[PDB]
Coordinates of C-alpha atoms and ligand atoms in Angstrom, one line a residue:
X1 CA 149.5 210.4 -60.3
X2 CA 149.3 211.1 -64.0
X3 CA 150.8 214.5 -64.5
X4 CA 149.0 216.9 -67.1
X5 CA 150.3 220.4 -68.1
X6 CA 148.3 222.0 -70.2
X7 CA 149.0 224.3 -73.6
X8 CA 146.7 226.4 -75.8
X9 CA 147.5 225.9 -79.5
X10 CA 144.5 226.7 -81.5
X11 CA 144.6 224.1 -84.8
X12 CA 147.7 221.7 -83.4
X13 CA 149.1 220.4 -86.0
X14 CA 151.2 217.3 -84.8
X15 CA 155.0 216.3 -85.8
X16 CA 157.6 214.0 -83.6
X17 CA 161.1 214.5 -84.5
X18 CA 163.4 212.6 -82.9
X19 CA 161.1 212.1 -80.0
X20 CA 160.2 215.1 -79.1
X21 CA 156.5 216.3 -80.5
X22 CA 155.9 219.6 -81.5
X23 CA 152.4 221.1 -81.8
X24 CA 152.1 223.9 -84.9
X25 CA 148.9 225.7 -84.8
X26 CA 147.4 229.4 -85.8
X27 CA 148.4 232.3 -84.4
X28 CA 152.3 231.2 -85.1
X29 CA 151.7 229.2 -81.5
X30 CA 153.4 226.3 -80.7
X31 CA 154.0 224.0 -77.8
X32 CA 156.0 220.5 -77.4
X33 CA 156.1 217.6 -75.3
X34 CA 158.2 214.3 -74.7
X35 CA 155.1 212.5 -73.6
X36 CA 152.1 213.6 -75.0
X37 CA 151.3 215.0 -71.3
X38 CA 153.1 217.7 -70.2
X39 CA 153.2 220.1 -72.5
X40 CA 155.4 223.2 -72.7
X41 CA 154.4 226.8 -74.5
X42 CA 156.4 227.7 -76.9
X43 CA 154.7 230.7 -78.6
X44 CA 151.6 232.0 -78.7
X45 CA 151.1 234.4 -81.1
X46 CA 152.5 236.9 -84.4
X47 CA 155.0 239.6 -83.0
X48 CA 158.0 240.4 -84.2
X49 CA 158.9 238.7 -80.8
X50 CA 157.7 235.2 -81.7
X51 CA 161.1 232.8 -82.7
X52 CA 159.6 231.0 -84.9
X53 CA 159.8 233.4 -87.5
X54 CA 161.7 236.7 -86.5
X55 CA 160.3 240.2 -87.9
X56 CA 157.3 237.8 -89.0
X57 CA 155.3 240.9 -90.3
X58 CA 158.7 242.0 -92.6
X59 CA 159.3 238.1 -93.5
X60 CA 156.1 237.2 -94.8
X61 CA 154.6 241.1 -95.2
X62 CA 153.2 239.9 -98.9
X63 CA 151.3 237.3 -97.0
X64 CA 149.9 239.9 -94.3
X65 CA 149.2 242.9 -96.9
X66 CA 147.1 240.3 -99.2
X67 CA 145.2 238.8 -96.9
X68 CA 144.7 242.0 -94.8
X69 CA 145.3 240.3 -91.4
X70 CA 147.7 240.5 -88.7
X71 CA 148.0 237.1 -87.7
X72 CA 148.7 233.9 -89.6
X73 CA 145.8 230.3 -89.3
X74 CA 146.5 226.8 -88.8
X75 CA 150.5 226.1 -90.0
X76 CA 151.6 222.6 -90.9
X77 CA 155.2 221.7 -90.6
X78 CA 156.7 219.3 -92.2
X79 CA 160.1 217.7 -92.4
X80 CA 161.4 216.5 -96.0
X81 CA 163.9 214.3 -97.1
X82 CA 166.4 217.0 -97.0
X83 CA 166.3 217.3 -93.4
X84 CA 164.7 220.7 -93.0
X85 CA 161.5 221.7 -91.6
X86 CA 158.5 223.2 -93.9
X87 CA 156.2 225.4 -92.4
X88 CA 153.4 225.6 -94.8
X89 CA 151.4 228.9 -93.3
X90 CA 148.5 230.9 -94.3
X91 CA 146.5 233.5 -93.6
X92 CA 142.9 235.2 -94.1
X93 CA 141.2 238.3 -94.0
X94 CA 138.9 236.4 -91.9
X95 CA 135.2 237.7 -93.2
X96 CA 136.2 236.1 -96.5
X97 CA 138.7 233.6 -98.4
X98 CA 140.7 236.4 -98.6
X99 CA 143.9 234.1 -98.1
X100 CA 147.7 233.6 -99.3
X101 CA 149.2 229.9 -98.4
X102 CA 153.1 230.0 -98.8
X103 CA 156.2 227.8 -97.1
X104 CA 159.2 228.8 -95.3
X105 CA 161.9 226.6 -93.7
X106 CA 164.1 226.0 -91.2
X107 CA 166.9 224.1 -90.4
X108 CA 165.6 223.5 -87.0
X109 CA 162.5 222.7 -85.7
X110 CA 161.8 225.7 -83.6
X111 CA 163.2 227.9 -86.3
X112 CA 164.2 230.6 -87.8
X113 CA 161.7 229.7 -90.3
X114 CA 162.9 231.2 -93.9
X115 CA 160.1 232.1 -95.8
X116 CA 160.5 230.7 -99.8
X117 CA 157.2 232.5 -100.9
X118 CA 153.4 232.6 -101.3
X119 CA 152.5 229.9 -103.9
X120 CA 148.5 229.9 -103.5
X121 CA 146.1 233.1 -103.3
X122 CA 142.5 232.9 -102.9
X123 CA 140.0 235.6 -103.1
X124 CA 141.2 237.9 -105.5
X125 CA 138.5 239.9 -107.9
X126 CA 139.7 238.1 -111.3
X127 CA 141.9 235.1 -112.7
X128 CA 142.5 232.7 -110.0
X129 CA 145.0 229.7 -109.6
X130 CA 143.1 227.4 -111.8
X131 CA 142.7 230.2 -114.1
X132 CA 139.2 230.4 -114.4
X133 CA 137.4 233.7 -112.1
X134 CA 138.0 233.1 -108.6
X135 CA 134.7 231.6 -107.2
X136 CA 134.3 231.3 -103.4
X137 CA 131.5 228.7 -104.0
X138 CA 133.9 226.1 -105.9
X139 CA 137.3 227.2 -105.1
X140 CA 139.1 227.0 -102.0
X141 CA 140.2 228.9 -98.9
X142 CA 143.6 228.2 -99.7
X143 CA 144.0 228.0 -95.3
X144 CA 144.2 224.7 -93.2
X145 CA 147.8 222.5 -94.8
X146 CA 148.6 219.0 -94.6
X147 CA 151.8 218.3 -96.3
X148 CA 152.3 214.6 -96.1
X149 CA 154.2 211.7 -97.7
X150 CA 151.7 208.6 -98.9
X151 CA 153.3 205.0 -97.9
X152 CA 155.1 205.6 -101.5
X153 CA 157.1 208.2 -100.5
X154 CA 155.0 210.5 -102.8
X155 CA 154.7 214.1 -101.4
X156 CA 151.1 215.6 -101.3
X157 CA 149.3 218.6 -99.2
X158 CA 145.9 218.6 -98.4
X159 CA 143.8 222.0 -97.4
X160 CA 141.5 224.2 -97.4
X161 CA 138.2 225.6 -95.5
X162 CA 134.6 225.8 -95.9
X163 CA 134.3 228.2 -99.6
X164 CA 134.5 225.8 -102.1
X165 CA 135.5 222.9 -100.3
X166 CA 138.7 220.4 -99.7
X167 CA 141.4 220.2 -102.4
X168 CA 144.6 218.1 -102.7
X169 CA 148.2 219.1 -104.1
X170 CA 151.0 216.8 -105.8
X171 CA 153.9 218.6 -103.9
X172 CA 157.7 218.8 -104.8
X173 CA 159.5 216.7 -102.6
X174 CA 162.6 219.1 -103.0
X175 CA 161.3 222.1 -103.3
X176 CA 158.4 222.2 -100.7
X177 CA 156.0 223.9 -103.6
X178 CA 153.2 222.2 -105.8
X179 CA 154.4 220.6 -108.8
X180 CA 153.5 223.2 -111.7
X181 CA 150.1 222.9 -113.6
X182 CA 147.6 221.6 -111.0
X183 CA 145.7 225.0 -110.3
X184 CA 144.1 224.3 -106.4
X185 CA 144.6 220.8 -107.4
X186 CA 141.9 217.8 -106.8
X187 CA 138.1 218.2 -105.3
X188 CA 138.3 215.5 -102.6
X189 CA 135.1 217.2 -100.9
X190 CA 132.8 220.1 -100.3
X191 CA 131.5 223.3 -102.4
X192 CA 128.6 226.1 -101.3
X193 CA 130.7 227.0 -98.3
X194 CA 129.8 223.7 -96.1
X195 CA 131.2 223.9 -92.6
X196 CA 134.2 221.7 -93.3
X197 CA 137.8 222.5 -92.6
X198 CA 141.1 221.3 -91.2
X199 CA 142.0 218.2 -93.4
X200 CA 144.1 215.9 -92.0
X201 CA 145.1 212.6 -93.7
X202 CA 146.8 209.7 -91.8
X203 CA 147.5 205.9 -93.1
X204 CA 147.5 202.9 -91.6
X205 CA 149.6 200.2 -92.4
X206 CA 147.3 197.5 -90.8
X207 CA 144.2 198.5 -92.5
X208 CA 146.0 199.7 -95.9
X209 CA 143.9 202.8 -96.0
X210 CA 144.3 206.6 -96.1
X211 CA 141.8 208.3 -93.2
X212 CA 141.1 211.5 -93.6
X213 CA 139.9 213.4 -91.2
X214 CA 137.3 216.6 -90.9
X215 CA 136.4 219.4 -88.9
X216 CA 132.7 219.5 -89.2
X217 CA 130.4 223.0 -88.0
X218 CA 132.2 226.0 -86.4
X219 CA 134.7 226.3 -83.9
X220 CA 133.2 228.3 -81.2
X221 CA 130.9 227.3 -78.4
X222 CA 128.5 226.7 -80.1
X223 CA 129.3 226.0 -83.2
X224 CA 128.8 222.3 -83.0
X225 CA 132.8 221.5 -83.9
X226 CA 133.1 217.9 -84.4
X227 CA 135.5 216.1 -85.4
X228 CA 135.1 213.6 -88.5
X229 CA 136.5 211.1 -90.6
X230 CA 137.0 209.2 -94.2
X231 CA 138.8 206.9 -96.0
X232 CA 140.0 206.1 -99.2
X233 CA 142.9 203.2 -100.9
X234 CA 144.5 206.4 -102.4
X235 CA 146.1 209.9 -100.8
X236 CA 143.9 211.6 -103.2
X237 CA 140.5 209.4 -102.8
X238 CA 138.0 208.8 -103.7
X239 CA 137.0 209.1 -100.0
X240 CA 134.0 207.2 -98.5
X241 CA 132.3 207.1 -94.9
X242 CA 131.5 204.1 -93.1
X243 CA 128.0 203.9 -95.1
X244 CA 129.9 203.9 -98.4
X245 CA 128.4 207.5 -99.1
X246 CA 131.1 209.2 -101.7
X247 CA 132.5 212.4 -99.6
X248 CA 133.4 214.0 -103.1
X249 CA 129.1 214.2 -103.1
X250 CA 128.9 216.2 -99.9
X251 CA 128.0 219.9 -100.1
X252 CA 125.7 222.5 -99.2
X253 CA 122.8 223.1 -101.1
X254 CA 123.4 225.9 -104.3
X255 CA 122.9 229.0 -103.6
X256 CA 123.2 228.4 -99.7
X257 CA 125.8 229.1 -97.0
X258 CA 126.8 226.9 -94.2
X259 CA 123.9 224.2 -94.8
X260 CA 124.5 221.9 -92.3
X261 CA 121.6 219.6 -92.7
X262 CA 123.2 218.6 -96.3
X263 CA 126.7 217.6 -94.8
X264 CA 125.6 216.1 -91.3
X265 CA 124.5 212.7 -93.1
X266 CA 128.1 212.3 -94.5
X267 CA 131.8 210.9 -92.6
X268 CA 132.1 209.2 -89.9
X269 CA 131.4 211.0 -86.7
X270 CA 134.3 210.3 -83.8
X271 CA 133.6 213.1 -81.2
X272 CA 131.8 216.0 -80.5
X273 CA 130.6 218.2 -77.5
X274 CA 129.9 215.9 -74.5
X275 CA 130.6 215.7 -70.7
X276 CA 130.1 212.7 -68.4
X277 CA 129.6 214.8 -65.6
X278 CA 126.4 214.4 -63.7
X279 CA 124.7 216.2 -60.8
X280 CA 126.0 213.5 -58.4
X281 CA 129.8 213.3 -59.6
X282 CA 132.5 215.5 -61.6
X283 CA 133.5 214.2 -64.7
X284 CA 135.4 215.3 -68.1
X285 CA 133.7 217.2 -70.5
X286 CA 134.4 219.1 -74.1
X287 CA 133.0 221.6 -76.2
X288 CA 133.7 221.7 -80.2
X289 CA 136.7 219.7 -80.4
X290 CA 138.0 219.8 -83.7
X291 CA 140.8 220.9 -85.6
X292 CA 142.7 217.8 -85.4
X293 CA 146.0 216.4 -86.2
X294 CA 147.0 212.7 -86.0
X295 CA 149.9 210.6 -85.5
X296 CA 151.0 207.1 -86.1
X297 CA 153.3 206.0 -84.3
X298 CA 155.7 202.8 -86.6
X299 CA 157.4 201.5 -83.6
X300 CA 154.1 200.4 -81.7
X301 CA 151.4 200.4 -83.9
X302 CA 149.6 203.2 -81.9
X303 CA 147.8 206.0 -83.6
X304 CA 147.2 209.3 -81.7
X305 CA 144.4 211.8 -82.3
X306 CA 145.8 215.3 -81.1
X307 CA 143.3 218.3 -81.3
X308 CA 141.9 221.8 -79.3
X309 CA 139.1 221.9 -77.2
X310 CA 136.9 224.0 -75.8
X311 CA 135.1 223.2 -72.2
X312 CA 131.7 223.4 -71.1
X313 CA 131.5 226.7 -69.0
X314 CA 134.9 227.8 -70.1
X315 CA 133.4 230.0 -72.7
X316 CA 136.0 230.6 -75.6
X317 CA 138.6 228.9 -73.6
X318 CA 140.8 226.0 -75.6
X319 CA 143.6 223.8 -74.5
X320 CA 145.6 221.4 -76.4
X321 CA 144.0 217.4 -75.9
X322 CA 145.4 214.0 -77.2
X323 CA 143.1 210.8 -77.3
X324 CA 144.5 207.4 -78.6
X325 CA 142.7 205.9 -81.6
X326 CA 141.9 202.5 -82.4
X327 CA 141.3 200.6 -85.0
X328 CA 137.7 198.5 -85.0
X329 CA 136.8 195.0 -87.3
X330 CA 136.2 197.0 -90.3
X331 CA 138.7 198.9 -90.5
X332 CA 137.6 202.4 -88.7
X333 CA 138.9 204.0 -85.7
X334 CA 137.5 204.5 -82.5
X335 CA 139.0 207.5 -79.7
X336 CA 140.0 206.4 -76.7
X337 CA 137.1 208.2 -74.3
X338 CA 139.6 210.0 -71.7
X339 CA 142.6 211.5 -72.5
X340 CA 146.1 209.7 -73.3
X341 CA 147.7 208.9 -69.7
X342 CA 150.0 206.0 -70.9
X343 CA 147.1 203.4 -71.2
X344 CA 147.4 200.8 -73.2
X345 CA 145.1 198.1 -75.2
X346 CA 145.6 195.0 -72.9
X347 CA 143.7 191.7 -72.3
X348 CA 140.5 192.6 -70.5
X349 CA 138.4 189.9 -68.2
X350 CA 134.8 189.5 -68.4
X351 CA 135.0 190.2 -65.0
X352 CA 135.9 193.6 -65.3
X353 CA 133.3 194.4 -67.7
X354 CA 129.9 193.5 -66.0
X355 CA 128.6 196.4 -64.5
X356 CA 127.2 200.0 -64.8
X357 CA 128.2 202.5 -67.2
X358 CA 127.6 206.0 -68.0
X359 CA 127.0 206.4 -71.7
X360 CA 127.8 209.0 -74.3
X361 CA 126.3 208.9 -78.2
X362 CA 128.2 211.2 -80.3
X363 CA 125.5 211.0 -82.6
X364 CA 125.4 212.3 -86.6
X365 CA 125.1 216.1 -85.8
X366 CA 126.2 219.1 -86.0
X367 CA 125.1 220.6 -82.7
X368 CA 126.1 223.1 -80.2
X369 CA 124.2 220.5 -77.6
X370 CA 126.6 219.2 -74.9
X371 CA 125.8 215.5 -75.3
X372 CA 125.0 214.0 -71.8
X373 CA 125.4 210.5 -70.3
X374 CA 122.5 207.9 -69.8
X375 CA 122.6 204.7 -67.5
X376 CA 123.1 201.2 -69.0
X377 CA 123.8 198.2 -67.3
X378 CA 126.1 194.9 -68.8
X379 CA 124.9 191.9 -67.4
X380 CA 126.9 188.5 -66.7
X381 CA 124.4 187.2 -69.1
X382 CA 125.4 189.5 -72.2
X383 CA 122.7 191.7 -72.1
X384 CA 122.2 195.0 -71.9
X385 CA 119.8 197.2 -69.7
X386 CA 119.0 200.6 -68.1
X387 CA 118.1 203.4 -69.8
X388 CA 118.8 201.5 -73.3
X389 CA 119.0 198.0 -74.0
X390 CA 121.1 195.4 -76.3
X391 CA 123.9 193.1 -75.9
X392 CA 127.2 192.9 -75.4
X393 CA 130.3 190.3 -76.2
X394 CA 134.4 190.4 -76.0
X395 CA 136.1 189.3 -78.9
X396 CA 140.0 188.4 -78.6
X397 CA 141.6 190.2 -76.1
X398 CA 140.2 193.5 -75.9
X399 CA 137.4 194.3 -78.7
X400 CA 134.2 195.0 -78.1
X401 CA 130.9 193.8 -79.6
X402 CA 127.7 195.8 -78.5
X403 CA 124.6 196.0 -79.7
X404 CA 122.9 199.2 -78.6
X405 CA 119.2 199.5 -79.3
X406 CA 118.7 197.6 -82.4
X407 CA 122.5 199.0 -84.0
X408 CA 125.7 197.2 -84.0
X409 CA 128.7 198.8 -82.9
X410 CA 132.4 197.7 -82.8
X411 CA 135.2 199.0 -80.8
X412 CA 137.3 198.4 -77.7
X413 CA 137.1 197.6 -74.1
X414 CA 139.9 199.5 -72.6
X415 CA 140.9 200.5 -68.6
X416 CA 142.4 204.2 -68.5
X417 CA 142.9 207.0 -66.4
X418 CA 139.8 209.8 -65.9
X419 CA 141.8 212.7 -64.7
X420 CA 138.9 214.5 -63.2
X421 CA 138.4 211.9 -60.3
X422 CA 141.9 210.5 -60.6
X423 CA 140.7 207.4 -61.3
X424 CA 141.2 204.0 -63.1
X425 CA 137.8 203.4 -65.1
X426 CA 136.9 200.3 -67.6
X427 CA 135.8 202.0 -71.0
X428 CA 134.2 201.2 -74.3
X429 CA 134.5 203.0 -77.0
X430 CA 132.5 201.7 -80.2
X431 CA 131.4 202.7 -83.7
X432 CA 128.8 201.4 -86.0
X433 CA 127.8 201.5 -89.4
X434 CA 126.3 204.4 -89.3
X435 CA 129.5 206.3 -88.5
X436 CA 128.0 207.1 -84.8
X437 CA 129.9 206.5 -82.0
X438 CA 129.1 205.5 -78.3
X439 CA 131.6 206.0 -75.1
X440 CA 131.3 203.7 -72.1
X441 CA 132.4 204.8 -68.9
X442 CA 131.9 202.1 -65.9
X443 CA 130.1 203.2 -62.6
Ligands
CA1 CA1 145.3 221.6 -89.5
CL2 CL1 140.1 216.3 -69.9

């Protein structure tokens, strides 16, 4: 009975206004929804057709002829306390950091968007923002915004894409652009052109932190997208994983490009490429989800993780997914292992526990392997057995204590919907120490 339409914005970029939700991506695409189910296509791509920004390629034609592209990467928008809508976009020459960031705005959410000007450049031959040489291997890709207010009210923007890493940007609350003198801003991450990209930073009031989260690998099939995340006290870090390992430490190796053995160790892991399906039954199933947005929502405590997807044996194919996030004991969150269908954390009986599950580990890597499901059993006695072994306990209403093969993990039990066999199924969805995280599916 849960109704699903589906909508392809690559890099969603999430913002609720006035209870609607709007979904900015690349590509100048767009989509919204009332209940983070159906969705509805706005746009889809840079024409001087597209609303958003009318005669986009004479509005923003500095942005196009500097970065030698005809399409624009992943947008933020963001309202500010004036009312109006910023629309930080970017683009890049695509084979290199070949990139202008600038910021238009609108009066309305679905536009026109006004464009105030290019403020950051990367890739140019000499003097760069900071004003020392531009240097790919330090410096950013100035692609991939987050403009966001800290629980102060304080206005910052977050960016950037493998090149020299992930930077941070005191903003001007009334002007949409960086306050003067900061150069790319502040190293929060990265350098040697690491596979790392799409910031995103969200707080939680319940756990008084700042979680930032990461696109780890590339975004294609088989790129090993993951998606990732940190967290710090402050908006501008420093960030740490679940280990305590200092994100501002992770980086390829000099003199290297795209080392992924160097950055695999570091962030917390939350999903990667996986399907539950099995030669006997269907089931759901992603490839390289990543590019993620997030959203906290003040009225309920909930917290949203919105994202694209790819699908195993949908080649390039990507749709627009939402998974509800929770927040374990110490203070990390755990996705939700189906898709947002109006579920809800509730009390859960022991009862509806005991059984068989199917069992995904997300793991630590970057890998273009489709993760597969293995059998485990909870007993009535607490144990666990099957194809691993452990123990399992309920805490409180709904959280979930399992130990999995000598590591203890901490989540949620949770009942949702599985929307491949229209079903009701118990979950768990657990993390540990380690960062890794384990999805339970019953039967
Ligand atoms: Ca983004
Ligand atoms: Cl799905």
């Amino acid at each position: 009975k849960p109704i699903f339409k589906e909508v392809s914005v690559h890099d969603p970029s999430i913002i609720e206004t006035n209870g609607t939700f709007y979904v900015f991506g690349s590509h100048l695409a767009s989509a919204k929804s009332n209940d983070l189910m159906q969705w509805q296509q706005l746009t889809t791509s840079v024409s001087n057709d597209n609303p958003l920004i009318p005669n986009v390629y004479e509005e923003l034609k500095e942005t196009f002829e500097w970065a030698q592209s005809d399409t624009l990467w992943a947008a933020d928008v963001t309202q500010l306390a004036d009312g109006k809508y910023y629309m930080y976009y970017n683009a890049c020459r695509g084979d290199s950091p070949r990139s202008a960031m600038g910021v238009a705005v609108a009066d309305n959410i679905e536009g026109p968007y006004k464009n105030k000007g290019i403020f950051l450049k990367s890739g140019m031959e000499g003097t760069s923002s900071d004003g020392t040489p531009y240097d790919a291997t330090k410096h950013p890709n100035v692609v991939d915004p987050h403009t966001f207010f800290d629980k102060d009210g304080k206005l910052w923007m977050v960016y950037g894409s493998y090149s020299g890493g992930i930077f941070i940007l005191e903003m001007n609350p009334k002007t949409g652009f960086p306050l003067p003198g900061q150069g790319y801003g502040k190293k929060l991450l990265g350098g040697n052109h690491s596979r790392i990209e799409g910031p995103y930073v969200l707080y939680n009031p319940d756990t008084q932190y700042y979680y930032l989260y990461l696109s780890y690998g590339g975004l294609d099939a088989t790129g090993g997208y993951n998606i990732r995340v940190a967290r710090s006290k402050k908006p501008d870090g420093p960030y740490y994983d679940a280990e305590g390992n200092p994100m501002l430490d992770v980086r390829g190796k000099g003199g290297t490009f795209f080392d992924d053995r160097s950055i695999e160790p570091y962030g917390v892991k939350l999903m990667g490429s996986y399907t539950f399906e099995t030669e006997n039954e269907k089931g759901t199933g992603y490839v390289s989800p990543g590019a993620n947005s997030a959203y906290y929502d003040e009225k309920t405590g909930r917290s949203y993780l919105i994202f694209h997807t790819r699908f195993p044996g949908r080649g390039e194919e990507h749709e627009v997914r939402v998974h509800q996030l929770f927040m374990n004991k110490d203070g990390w969150p755990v996705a939700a292992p189906y898709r947002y269908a109006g579920e809800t954390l509730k009390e859960v009986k022991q009862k509806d526990i005991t059984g068989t599950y199917k069992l995904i580990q997300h793991g630590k890597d970057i890998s273009a392997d489709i993760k597969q499901t293995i059998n485990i059993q909870l007993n009535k006695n607490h144990t666990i057995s099957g194809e691993m072994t452990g123990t399992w306990r309920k805490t409180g209403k709904n959280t979930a204590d399992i130990t999995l093969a000598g590591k203890k993990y901490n989540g949620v039990f949770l009942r949702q919907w599985d929307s491949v066999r229209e079903k009701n199924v118990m979950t768990f969805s657990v993390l540990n120490t380690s960062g890794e995280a384990v999805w339970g599916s019953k039967l």
